Amino acid sequence: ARIKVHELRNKTKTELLAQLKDLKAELALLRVAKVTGGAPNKLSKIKVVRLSIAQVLTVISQKQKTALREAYKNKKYLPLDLRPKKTRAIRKRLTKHQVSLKTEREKKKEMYFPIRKYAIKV
């Protein structure tokens, strides 16, 4: 009778929404029982129902976000909420290629006269 997350992931959006509606109705009934001097057995179910509602909402949200990420894959100008967060400073940084850019003379210098491997023995 307990909710299993791995079983929720195998359900469709409509079934998840129906289960969420049923859980919300049960939670409302439990609140009514609580306000009407309900027994401790009914009161203990409030936590279970709230956990089930949270689990269903989490599964729905994760499925939707995965779908959106797949839809926006291999595409530029993603929604801000779907872009990497990191930090502000890191986001502002120059790319690795931009950091490695150099003038033609510097490239010629590194190609012609790199630091050689040498030893001092003989």
Partner RNA sequence: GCGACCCCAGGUCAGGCGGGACUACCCGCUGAGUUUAAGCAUAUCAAUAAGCGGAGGAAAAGAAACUUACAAGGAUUCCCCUAGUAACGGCGAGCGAACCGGGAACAGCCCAGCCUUAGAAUCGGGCGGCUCCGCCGUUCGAAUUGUAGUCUGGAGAAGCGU
Partner RNA sequence: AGUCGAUCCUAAGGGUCGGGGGAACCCCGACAGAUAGCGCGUUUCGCGCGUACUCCGAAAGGGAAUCGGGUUAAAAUUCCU
Partner RNA sequence: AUUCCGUGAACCAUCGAGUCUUUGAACGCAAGUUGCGCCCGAAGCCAUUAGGCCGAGGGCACGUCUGCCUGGGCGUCACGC
- Is the CB of 77 or the CB of 118 nearer to another protein? 77
* Nearer to RNA (CB atom), residue 85 or residue 122: 85
Report the partner that residue 2 touches, choosing among another protein, RNA, none (CB closer than 5 to 8 A by kind). Answer: RNA
The least distance separating another protein from the CB of residue 101, rounded to whole angstroms, comes to 4
| Sign of CA pseudo-dihedral 26, 29, 35, 40 | negative
Judge whether 88 and 98 are in contact, CB under 8 Å: no
**Taking phi first (over 0 means left), then psi (-120 to 50 degrees means alpha), and beta for anything else, what does residue 121 get?**
alpha
The DSSP result for 42-60, as a single string, is HHHHHHHHHHHHHHHHHHH
Task: Using CB under 7 A, list all residues that contact RNA.
Answer: 1-2, 4-6, 58, 61-62, 65, 69, 74, 76-77, 89, 91-92, 95-98, 103-106, 108-109
62 binds, among RNA, another protein, none (CB under 5 to 8 A by kind): RNA
Nearer to another protein, 3 or 72 (CB): 72
Report the alpha-carbon distance of residue 91 to residue 79 in Å, rounded: 15
